[PDB]
Every structure is written in structure tokens, then in C-alpha cells.
Write a structure and sequence with these properties.
Elements lengths: L3 E6 L9 E2 L5 E4 L4 E5 L5 E6 L9 E2 L5 E4 L4 E5 L5 E6 L9 E2 L5 E4 L4 E5 L5 E6 L9 E2 L5 E4 L4 E5 L5 E6 L9 E2 L5 E4 L4 E5 L5 E6 L9 E2 L5 E4 L4 E5 L5 E6 L9 E2 L5 E4 L4 E5 L5 E6 L9 E2 L5 E4 L4 E5 L2
PDB class: de novo protein
Keywords: Beta-propeller, computationally designed, symmetrical, repeat protein, DE novo protein
Assembly: monomeric
Length: 320
């Protein structure tokens, strides 16, 4: 209903989406350098200090391990009881979330330019070098291919053995993670302003121009609609054929991916400070003001709660 359930205070801005564990624990990184585990009632379960700001979402493995990248250059593996299992050092800051393959391999991009494949025991499996920093999380297709965007402007498709399958060049840095449609189409936003729809063979299916850079991953509705936020301040609803369905204006850049609720509501944070709830027909359902710009994608709990991190330093739990 767009009202606050609770707020959890951290020491600095929250730029990264939380993630929810099997037992309902909420995990979130803060620019204050800590990974927090929060109970569903909003009280802190534990924290773990990394060396620098955490600006990427954690991801959870099958056994419960929580993996989180830090600006300190490491990917940490944290046990559910909040003690560290291991860390893996890259050459520079990690600003992108890791992703986990079906065999347990953890893939993470680093500002040192590479995509790393990490075994669950913390040892390197392989690394794939791109031309500039990777600030975007990878995504994995049903056949095991790993897709990742680079500040060198390309979307790379990497085979599970670390060899390149193809690369797709856009006009500027790709800071958005791609998302894969039911037919294997890969959608990815570029700083050149376009949402690109890419066929599994690396050829372009179509492109959609927005007014400014796209820094936010698209998300796909159950009807096939692709939703993506733009720095031009709009949330765009895009048909599978590349034509616009509707657009929704917020007051400032949208740097955060949207998320889709059980009833089909689309939620998205704006740099104007609000969380918006949008109906599938593009009309506003409600908005909620946090203290400062929202750069973090919201995440939905099983009871419908919407969790959103804000530059005002809090994680908000919002009723639906």
C-alpha cells in the first residue's frame, strides 16, 4: 500500500540491491563497507566489515553462502553465520554483483577489466579479459553461456570454458547487466542510450533509443514486455518487437533496474528519491519518498514487502 514497514540504518549510502535468503534474511551491502544480515522484522542479525564501500548486490549459493564484491578488490564468501569462508583478490574494485552457474562456479567482473570464474572453494577457474573496467554483473543462459558487458562498449558472450563465443559492440560503455528472454534473446542497455535486443548468435535483432545513457538492467514481464529505466528519467515499457508500449516519467535519472511484483506491479527507484509502483498499463499506483536518490534496484519479499536501499543510508521495507 506504499507505506513504510521499517527502516534499517547503515553508516553511508546504500547503492546496491539487497538479496533475500531461503529463511527470509535480508542481505545488503553499504558504502560504509559492511555486509549486513537483517532479520525480516528489521533488526540486525550480523555484519561483516570489508575494506571499502560495497556497491554491488550480494548473491546466495545453494548451500547458503553469501558472495559479495567490495571496492577493496575482493570477492568475499560469507557463511550464513556471518563468518568469512574465503576471499578472492582481483586487481581493482569490484562494483558488480557476482552470479552463480549451475555447477557452483561464481562469476564476477572487476574494474581490472576481467571476468573471473571462481570455484566454490575460492580458487580461480579462469579469467576473461575485456578492454576496460567491468562494472556490470554477468548473466548466464540456459545453455551455460556467460554474458557480460564492459566499459569497452561490448557485450561479450563467453563459453563456460573461458573462450569467447562472440562480442557485440555498442556505442559507449555497458554498465547494465543484460537480461535473457524466453526465446534466448539477450537485452542490454548501453551508455549510448539504446536498449539492444541481441539474437543468441550475436546479431542484432533490434534497438530502442532513449534520451540518455541506460545504466539499469532491463527486466521482463510475464507477457514478454521489456521494462528499462533511463537516465532521461523515464521507465520505458517495450514490446517484444522493439516498439514502445508506454513510458513513465519520474523527476530525475533512473539508475536502478525495476522489479515486477506478484500482481504485475512494476517497482522502480529514481534519483528524485521516490520508489514508484507502476501498473502494467503505465499508470502510477503510488510513490514513496526516501531521503535521497535511490540507485539500488528494489527487491520483493515473499509476503509482498518491497525492500529498497537509499542514498540516505537506510534500507526501507515498504508495504505493497
Amino acid at each position: 500500500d506504499g507505506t513504510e514497514k521499517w527502516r534499517f540504518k547503515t553508516g553511508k549510502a546504500i547503492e546496491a540491491s539487497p538479496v533475500i535468503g531461503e529463511d527470509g534474511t535480508i542481505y545488503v551491502g553499504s558504502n560504509d563497507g559492511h555486509l549486513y544480515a537483517i532479520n525480516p522484522d528489521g533488526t540486525e542479525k550480523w555484519r561483516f566489515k570489508t575494506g571499502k564501500a560495497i556497491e554491488a548486490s550480494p548473491v546466495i549459493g545453494e548451500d547458503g553462502t553469501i558472495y559479495v564484491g567490495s571496492n577493496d578488490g575482493h570477492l568475499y564468501a560469507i557463511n550464513p553465520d556471518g563468518t568469512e569462508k574465503w576471499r578472492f583478490k582481483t586487481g581493482k574494485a569490484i562494483e558488480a554483483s557476482p552470479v552463480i552457474g549451475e555447477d557452483g562456479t561464481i562469476y564476477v567482473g572487476s574494474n581490472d577489466g576481467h571476468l573471473y570464474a571462481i570455484n566454490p572453494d575460492g580458487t580461480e577457474k579462469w579469467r576473461f579479459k575485456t578492454g576496460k573496467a567491468i562494472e556490470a554483473s554477468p548473466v548466464i543462459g540456459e545453455d551455460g553461456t556467460i554474458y557480460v558487458g564492459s566499459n569497452d562498449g561490448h557485450l561479450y558472450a563467453i563459453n563456460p570454458d573461458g573462450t569467447e563465443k562472440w562480442r557485440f559492440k555498442t556505442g559507449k560503455a555497458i554498465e547494465a547487466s543484460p537480461v535473457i528472454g524466453e526465446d534466448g534473446t539477450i537485452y542490454v542497455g548501453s551508455n549510448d542510450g539504446h536498449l539492444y535486443a541481441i539474437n543468441p548468435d550475436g546479431t542484432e535483432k533490434w534497438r530502442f533509443k532513449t534520451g540518455k545513457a541506460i545504466e539499469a538492467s532491463p527486466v521482463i514481464g510475464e507477457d514478454g514486455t521489456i521494462y528499462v529505466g533511463s537516465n532521461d528519467g523515464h521507465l520505458y515499457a517495450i514490446n517484444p518487437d522493439g516498439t514502445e508500449k508506454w513510458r513513465f516519467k519520474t523527476g530525475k535519472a533512473i539508475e536502478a533496474s525495476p522489479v515486477i511484483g506478484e500482481d504485475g506491479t512494476i517497482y522502480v527507484g529514481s534519483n528524485d528519491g521516490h520508489l514508484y509502483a507502476i501498473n502494467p498499463d503505465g499508470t502510477e499506483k503510488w510513490r514513496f519518498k526516501t531521503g535521497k536518490a535511490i540507485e539500488a534496484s528494489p527487491v520483493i519479499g515473499e509476503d509482498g514487502t518491497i525492500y529498497v536501499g537509499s542514498n540516505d543510508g537506510h534500507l526501507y521495507a515498504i508495504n505493497p
